[PDB]
TrEMBL record, chain A:
Belongs to the RNA polymerase beta chain family. Transmembrane segments: none annotated. It is found in: Nucleus. The chain holds residues 528 to 575 of 1251 of the full protein. Signal peptide: none annotated. This is DNA-directed RNA polymerase subunit beta. It comes from the Eukaryota. RNA-dependent RNA polymerase that catalyzes the extension of a non-coding RNA (ncRNA) at the 3'-end using the four ribonucleoside triphosphates as substrates. An internal ncRNA sequence near the 3'-end serves as a template in a single-round Pol II-mediated RNA polymerization reaction. May decrease the stability of ncRNAs that repress Pol II-mediated gene transcription.
From TrEMBL, chain D:
It is found in: Chromosome; Cytoplasm; Nucleus. Belongs to the RNA polymerase beta' chain family. DNA-dependent RNA polymerase catalyzes the transcription of DNA into RNA using the four ribonucleoside triphosphates as substrates. The lineage of its organism: Eukaryota, Metazoa, Chordata, Craniata, Vertebrata. It comes from the Eukaryota. This is DNA-directed RNA polymerase subunit.
From TrEMBL, chain H:
The keyword ATP-binding does not apply. It is found in: Nucleus. Keywords: DNA-directed RNA polymerase, Metal-binding, Nucleus, Phosphoprotein, Transcription, Zinc. Residues 17-250 form the DNA-directed RNA polymerase RpoA/D/Rpb3-type domain. The keyword Transmembrane does not apply. This is DNA-directed RNA polymerase II subunit RPB3. GO terms for cellular component: DNA-directed RNA polymerase complex; nucleoplasm. Residues 191-214 are annotated as: Disordered. GO terms for biological process: DNA-templated transcription.
TrEMBL record, chain I:
It holds the Pfam family RNA_pol_L_2. It comes from Sus scrofa (Pig). Residues 31-103 form the DNA-directed RNA polymerase RBP11-like dimerisation domain. Its main location: nucleus. This is DNA-directed RNA polymerase II subunit RPB11-a. The gene is POLR2J.
Length: 48, 469, 66, 50, 49, 50, 49, 258, 115, 47, 47, 299
RNA sequence: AAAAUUAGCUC
């Protein structure tokens, strides 16, 4: 899932590729059609 | 000359026309409206209704010039309209200049939201909680589940279909692979074990196979050449040659080293007979503690490297017991508190004992009237004998009409009925509210969370107990 | 995946009514009429035939051999 | 005890009673201090050894 | 892919179901899906304050 | 720490506010060290034999 | 292999969906026909300006 | 300081359900007889399934579960057999159980429908419900699959599990007019009259009655098909009588010992 | 995993007494009967029958805990009528009543069939 | 006038007695019914 | 004298595979094969 | 029968049946009379029930209340009033607080146990529930609510007209836009309050929402008002819905439409469903709430 | 009796 080179993996993004959650058809669909913002996790701001 | 994805934005206030063609521009289709009237006339509807017989499809509509993809950056400069007829006939002059008109308002919802019946009758937080909890519902996740060897696959025995389905989920494919059962839910406080967000299930219902699901767990293991002298191989580790060995039964598996299918297993039991030569060390995997399953099938093959690679999956019949986490389609999560036998559950004038009993106090604080509407319409649909509709914005489904229908079957127009104290047989002074309603079962079983410890294994760095069940 | 054997709430045998219900729907009847033609009075037992999904067919498509 | 221990009334002693099924139980009145909700909560249980 | 526009018959014969949406890679025998990331549109002037 | 347990919780009004409904598995798994004494040597003897 | 059951189920499904389509159309025409009066408490719609 | 002289009157006797009425009896007795109908009624049912070869598409336990729910006619056999727990022999003796065998294999191309008719019982009278209306569908087999097993049946009652639950649904109801006010209708006019209501269509509910005790209990026991309804009633009465007799004996022994 | 078996609700365990008498001390002529492996079925009818009897000042049962298969019946009679004989009389008359009801039901059925 | 500050709104009534000044004038706000003293200015709420 | 019979993946034909042997079907030739059910006393209670 | 049965669920019953409040024509006990036996020792405390009209102590009937309020306990025996959270909940001078302060801690533990074990066993006979029947109005309250909402809409339109023609003078300390927004918000809040009051006064004693709210167990008058009368304004960041697009909330509405529905005012109620636009705005409000919850938990 | 790391879910 590290969208970058192996040597500098930590410098690249994380979670870009995830394991498809095959727990129930609805979950599969939701997963295949999901988004994710690059903003840092748990940011103090609340506009985004 | 211009594909349908391109977008032209006209900036009036400042004379700038900005056209975008690059990818990613999220967009959606809308109907066109020339002056006050749609381009989607009966001709188009007729030709389209005969689709799947000749060749007619969406592309025909897009080409004919009736629909049109507007991207968000262009959506800011179009006087959209909600429904064709209602917002155009003739009234106080609001805008009278619409340019497009949405297909159906309910099409804003997503995938997990859409299966929520009457979402507009619930407070948004509960809709969101339901959206998240839907992804945790059990059922048939894929038809060819018996061929998959995935890890942690749940499957439900009798996944019925919702008695009330939204028109949108017809295309979500939910009705072919449902994730819940229609249960006769009675909102009331029978005994007390369902007071703070908890439910009382019917022991007899469970005995009959109410929500009875199954739990699979796959395993992956292959042999490899550890080193010039080190090497792994499948073989029953005997009591003499193998120095490293566990204090567990090994004869349970056959000589080949792979436990045969349909064999009772329990926690801390050998599932694969891997031994590595140093004489040999028992470097073999065991079933996780507190699993207690039965072996479904054993798969053996060769990986890319060409070594013997085998996969084993164990199934487990998970009877619904107390502590299991259920949830309706409205965010009314809860955990089965206690289970009563049919003799003890209350009953209507006829032998209809509720299958689930939620707390009444869960309704007012959370404002989930949508749940009540679902229950009423479900009772009506059951009696009539056909699935009812719960599309979000319908303008033709109110409570008064649904009640009027229900009153034509000898039932209180509001859905309440007179129950009988299961124990003594005395009527209940208050008229309980009982009806069909679609309930799910989450994967959060109790047996997967219960844990204990008394001087267990210790870490190597700081001599403190380990972490994780 | 297959029609249950008994109604969860009531207990009346309903497993032996799936083929009959399908036949009645096929010939001419409608659901609301077929259900009472089979003799399912209580609305608790009707959800068995209305809501039940028939996945065993899809399962049988994956014939092991031949 | 319940995992978020905000204030003193979040770790109180109790007398043990063993019951068949596999779930911690506790009188509802004692729910308010812990802030538990019986909607899939988890509550730790330590035992002294002296 | 090998199932491009293939009838449900062959899919069933290939131990696959016609309902599977698809659109997910198979690495090391795991279903990997790419989450659509989002960012600021390029080649457009923004005036922040 | 050892001698810890974590399980879901459910209401149970028939128990007093100071009681707690532990399961059977957890009860069996944990232990309490008790000093032998002639006042209760018989009880511990029976427990050991069991 | 699918001559019985597997084919009868498809036949019943197709006829039932056709019956549902005609049922919906008749319900629509009936709703249009019975346009005498509509006085209901539990329903409302916005009216700006 | 003694009991009462209840009367009984059947209104509808069929081979599928019985509707009767009990008058001059206490509510506790009525509801207790109900709970005995549902819970404590001896009946035969499959309880031990040994599966030898199952190539169907359902689980191994799915077959056993379903087979647990197939009713078995026990009109005159339940009274004779003894609970397996109290048997004085090893293995399921025929004196204390009824053996079943099933062996089906889909050879032809058309899918099989393994129905309860495949359960070849050893005893003549203990058979699933097919004597005199399709049969309970167990599982569907496709060419090449097979299902071989044998199961034994034993006597139980609903209290232990649902499989021993002879009654489909007991309709118990008393005082159809809300004469004792045991329920308070916020709007009595809105409620539909009970099937047993003698009250005319004008009035909504009978006038209050202070010195009024519940009598005239209406029953609609509905047999699942295992036992005949009147047989269910007789068995429930006999079982309750036996439980009281045993309790009285135990109390007598306890008092004498003291 | 810790689900108790289904036979523990009605079948006695070795050493457990079916019925235990325990005299109370707070008021004269008051005993608590404790019944193992029973439910409301066998306690409610006895409670009602004791209520019918006029010499019984107090009568009531309870279930200490639903998961436990046990019930306690409290009986308190006039000083000249011990609660034991009250219990015996209640059960005896209740058995007589059920037998009479069975006989009447049987005759009613046999008359209903072609009659 | 413009420099001033707008007075806090509320339903003035004399049905509530302020415990800080003994006066009956005060204003109530429903949302729990908060009470603000009119002259004394006692602040309280009723559930 | 048990040669650890296996079931081919797609052929659904039995095969005799012993230790230190390639895992392939006697015919066609595939790399997948499952095992056969045990012979133990698989006894369930229809509960 | 019921009195003797409930007594069985009492760990501190002395064993004596209290004299029934009504000997003839038939021995009938009262709820308060039974509940007294639960109260331990000789406690004394005074409390006011939730629905206690303020203008009752001043007038006559101070010590004999028509509404059965003014909870008075003497020698640990309930005499008047209806117990609610104000008397049994967690509040200074609540009945349990007095019991703990006067009697020992164990006495208070027994008090709790007895209260629950008796009240649930009696609830078995009584029964509690909730359903559509408890959410429907009387078909006149709907008329009042519609009239009130129409008046509110007319008033906001008049305010907008005055602002457009430059007649609304800036309120002191605020700019013209600020005073305009303040007036609109006050008008909408007043309308919502009037509708809620009308809905409340239109309920019946048998209604279950009212029972749960007055008992204070779970809910509030605002919940009922939203369920029946009208949801209300959907604010974000302490203000009305902003203009995400160019000078307008959603593509449906026209530019410069400050009207109530064009800015978030959910005119419908949860029983009668929601128009799509107000549904979206309600979603925005819920999202704001969730974000605030997360940041609070983090900080 | 075994590592480093990331992600999802939950009160
Ligand atoms: Mg919670
Ligand atoms: Zn039913
Ligand atoms: Zn025998
Ligand atoms: Zn091969």
């Amino acid at each position: 899932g590290n969208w970058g080179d192996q040597k500098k993996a930590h410098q690249a993004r994380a979670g870009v590729s995830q394991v498809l959650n095959r727990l129930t058809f609805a979950s599969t669909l939701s997963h295949l059609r999901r988004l994710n913002s690059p903003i840092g996790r748990d940011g103090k701001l609340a506009k985004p | 000359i211009i594909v349908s994805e391109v977008s032209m934005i006209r900036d009036i206030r400042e004379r700038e026309i900005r056209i975008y063609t690059d990818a990613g521009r999220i967009c959606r289709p809308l109907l066109i409206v020339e002056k006050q009237k749609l381009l989607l006339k009966k001709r188009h509807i007729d030709q389209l209704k005969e689709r799947e017989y000749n060749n007619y499809s969406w592309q025909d509509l897009v080409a004919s010039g009736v629909v049109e993809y507007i991207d968000t950056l262009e959506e800011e400069t179009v006087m959209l309209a909600m429904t064709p007829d209602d917002l155009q006939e003739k009234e106080v002059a609001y805008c009278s200049t619409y340019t497009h008109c949405e297909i159906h308002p309910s099409m804003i919802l997503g995938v997990c939201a859409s299966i929520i019946p009457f979402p507009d009758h619930n407070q948004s937080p509960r809709n969101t909680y339901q959206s998240a909890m839907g992804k945790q519902a059990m059922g048939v996740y894929i038809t060819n589940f018996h061929v998959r060897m995935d890890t942690l696959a749940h499957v439900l025995y009798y996944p019925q279909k919702p008695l009330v389905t939204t028109r949108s989920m017809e295309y979500l494919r939910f009705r072919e692979l449902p994730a819940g059962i229609n249960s006769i839910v009675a909102i009331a406080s029978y005994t007390g074990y369902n007071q703070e967000d908890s439910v009382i299930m019917n022991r007899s219902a469970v005995d009959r196979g109410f929500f009875r699901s199954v739990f699979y767990r796959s395993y992956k293991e292959q042999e490899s050449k550890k080193g010039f002298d080190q090497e792994e191989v499948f073989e029953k580790p005997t009591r003499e040659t193998c120095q490293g060995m566990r204090h567990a039964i090994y004869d349970k598996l056959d000589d080949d080293g792979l436990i045969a299918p349909g064999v009772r297993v329990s926690g801390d039991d050998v599932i694969i007979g891997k031994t590595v030569t140093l004489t040999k060390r028992d470097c073999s995997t065991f079933l996780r503690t507190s699993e207690t399953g039965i072996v479904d099938q054993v798969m053996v093959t060769l990986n890319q490297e060409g070594y013997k690679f085998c996969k084993i999956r164990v199934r487990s019949v998970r009877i619904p017991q107390i502590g299991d986490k259920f949830a309706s389609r409205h965010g009314q999560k809860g955990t089965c508190g206690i289970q009563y036998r049919q003799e003890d559950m209350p009953f209507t004038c006829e032998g209809i004992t509720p299958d689930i009993i939620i707390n009444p106090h869960a309704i007012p604080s959370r404002m989930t009237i949508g749940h009540l509407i679902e229950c009423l319409q479900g009772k009506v649909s059951a009696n009539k004998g056909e699935i009812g509709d719960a599309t979000p914005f319908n303008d033709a489904v109110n409570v008064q009409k649904i009640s009027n229908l229900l009153s034509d079957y000898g039932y209180h127009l509001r859905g309440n009925e007179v129950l009988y104290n299961g124990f003594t047989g005395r009527k209940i002074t208050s008229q309980i509210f009982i009806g069909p309603t679609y309930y799910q079962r989450l994967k959060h079983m109790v047996d997967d969370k219960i844990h204990s410890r008394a001087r267990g294994p210790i870490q190597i760095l700081n001599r403190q107990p380990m972490e994780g069940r | 995946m297959i029609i249950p054997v008994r109604c969860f709430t009531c207990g009346k045998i309903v497993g032996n009514k799936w083929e009959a219900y399908l036949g009645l729907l096929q010939a001419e009847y409608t659901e609301g009429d077929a259900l009472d033609a089979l003799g399912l009075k209580r609305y608790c037992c009707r959800r068995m035939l209305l809501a039940h999904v028939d996945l065993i067919e899809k399962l049988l498509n994956y014939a092991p051999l031949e | 005890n319940r995992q978020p221990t905000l204030h003193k009334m979040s770790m109180m002693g109790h007398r043990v009673r063993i019951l068949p099924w596999s779930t911690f139980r506790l009188n509802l009145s004692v729910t308010t201090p812990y802030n538990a909700d019986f909607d899939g909560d988890e509550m730790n249980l330590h035992l002294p050894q002296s | 892919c090998l199932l491009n526009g293939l009838t449900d018959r062959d899919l069933c014969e290939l131990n696959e179901c016609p309902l599977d949406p698809g659109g997910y890679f198979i690495i090391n025998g795991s279903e990997k899906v790419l989450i659509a990331q989002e960012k600021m549109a390029t080649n457009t002037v923004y005036v922040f304050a | 720490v050892d001698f810890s347990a974590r399980t879901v919780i459910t209401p149970d009004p028939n128990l007093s506010i100071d009681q707690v409904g532990v399961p059977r598995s957890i009860a069996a798994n944990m232990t309490f060290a008790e000093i032998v004494t002639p006042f209760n040597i018989d009880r511990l003897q029976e427990l050991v034999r069991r | 292999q699918r001559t019985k059951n597997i084919s009868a189920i498809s036949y019943i499904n197709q006829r039932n969906r056709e019956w549902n389509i005609v049922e919906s159309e008749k319900a629509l025409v009936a709703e249009s026909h019975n346009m005498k009066n509509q006085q209901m408490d539990p329903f409302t719609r916005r009216q700006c300006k | 300081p003694y009991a009462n002289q209840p009367t009984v009157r059947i209104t509808e006797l069929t081979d599928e359900n019985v509707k009767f009425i009990i008058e001059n009896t206490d509510l506790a007795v009525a509801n207790s007889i109900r709970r005995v109908f549902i819970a404590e009624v001896p009946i035969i049912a499959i309880d031990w399934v040994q599966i030898d070869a199952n190539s169907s598409v359902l689980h191994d336990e799915f077959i056993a579960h379903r087979l647990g729910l197939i009713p078995l006619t026990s009109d005159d056999i339940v009274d004779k057999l003894q609970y397996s727990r109290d048997c004085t022999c090893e293995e399921f003796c025929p004196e204390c159980s009824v053996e079943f065998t099933l062996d089906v294999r889909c050879n032809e191309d058309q899918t099989r429908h393994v129905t309860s008719r495949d359960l070849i019982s050893n005893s003549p009278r203990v058979i699933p419900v097919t004597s005199r209306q399709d049969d309970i569908l167990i599982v569907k087999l496709r060419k090449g699959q097979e299902l071989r097993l044998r199961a034994y049946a034993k006597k139980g009652f609903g209290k232990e599990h649902a499989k021993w639950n002879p009654t489909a649904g007991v309709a118990f109801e008393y005082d159809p007019d809300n004469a004792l006010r045991h329920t308070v209708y916020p709007k009595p006019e809105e409620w539909p009259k009970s099937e047993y209501s003698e009250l005319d269509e004008d009035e909504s509910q009978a006038p209050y009655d202070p010195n009024g005790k519940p009598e005239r209990f209406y029953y609609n026991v509905e047999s699942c098909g295992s036992l005949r309804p009147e047989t269910i009633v007789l068995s429930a009465l006999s079982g309750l009588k036996k439980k009281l007799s045993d309790l009285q004996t135990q109390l007598s022994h306890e008092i004498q010992s003291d | 995993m810790n689900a108790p078996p289904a036979f523990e609700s009605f079948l006695l365990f070795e050493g457990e007494k079916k019925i235990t008498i325990n005299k109370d001390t707070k008021v004269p002529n008051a005993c608590l009967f404790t019944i193992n492996k029973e439910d409301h079925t066998l306690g409610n009818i006895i409670k009602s029958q004791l209520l019918k009897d006029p010499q019984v000042l107090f009568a009531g049962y309870k279930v200490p805990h639903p998961l436990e298969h046990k019930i306690i019946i409290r009986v308190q009679t006039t000083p000249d009528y011990s609660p034991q004989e009250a219990f015996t009389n209640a059960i005896t008359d209740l058995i007589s009543e059920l037998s009479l009801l069975e006989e009447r039901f049987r005759v009613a059925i046999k008359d209903k069939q072609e009659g | 006038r413009e420099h001033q500050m707008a007075k806090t709104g509320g339903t003035q009534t004399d049905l509530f007695t302020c415990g800080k000044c003994k006066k009956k004038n005060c204003t109530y706000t429903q949302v729990t019914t908060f009470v603000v003293c009119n002259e004394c200015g006692n602040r309280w709420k009723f559930c | 004298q048990q040669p650890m019979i296996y079931i081919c993946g797609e052929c659904h034909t039995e095969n005799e595979i012993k230790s230190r042997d390639p895992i392939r079907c006697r015919e066609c030739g595939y790399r997948i094969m499952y095992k056969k059910r045990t012979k133990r006393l698989v006894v369930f209670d229809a509960r | 029968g019921e009195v003797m049965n409930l007594l069985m669920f009492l760990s501190t019953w002395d064993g004596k049946v209290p004299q029934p409040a009504i000997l003839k024509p038939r021995p009938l006990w009262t709820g308060k009379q039974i509940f007294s036996l639960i109260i331990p020792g000789h406690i004394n405390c005074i409390r006011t029930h939730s629905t206690h009209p303020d203008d009752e102590d001043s007038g006559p009937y101070k010590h004999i209340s028509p509404g059965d309020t003014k909870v008075v306990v003497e020698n640990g025996e309930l005499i008047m009033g209806i117990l609610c959270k104000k008397s049994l909940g967690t509040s200074a001078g609540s009945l349990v607080h007095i019991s703990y302060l006067e009697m020992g801690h164990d006495i208070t533990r027994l008090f709790y146990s007895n209260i629950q074990t008796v009240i649930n066993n009696w609830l078995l006979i009584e029964g509690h529930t909730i359903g559509i029947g408890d959410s429907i109005a009387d078909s006149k309250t709907y008329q009042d609510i519609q009239n009130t909402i129409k008046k509110a809409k007319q008033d906001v339109i008049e305010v907008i007209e005055k602002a457009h023609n430059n007649e609304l003078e800036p309120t002191p300390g605020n700019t013209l836009r600020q005073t305009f927004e303040n007036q609109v918000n006050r008008i909408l809040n007043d309308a919502r309050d009037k509708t809620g009051s009308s809905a409340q006064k239109s309920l019946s004693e048998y209604n279950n929402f009212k029972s749960m709210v007055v008992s204070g167990a779970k809910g509030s008058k605002i919940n009922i008002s939203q369920v029946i009368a009208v949801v209300g304004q959907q604010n974000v960041e302490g203000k009305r819905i902003p203009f995400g697009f160019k000078h307008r909330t959603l593509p449906h509405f026209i530019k410069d439409d400050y009207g109530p529905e064009s800015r978030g005012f959910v005119e419908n109620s949860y029983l009668a469903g929601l128009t799509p636009t107000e549904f979206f705005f309600h979603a925005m409000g819920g999202r704001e709430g969730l974000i605030d919850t997360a940041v609070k938990t983090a900080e």
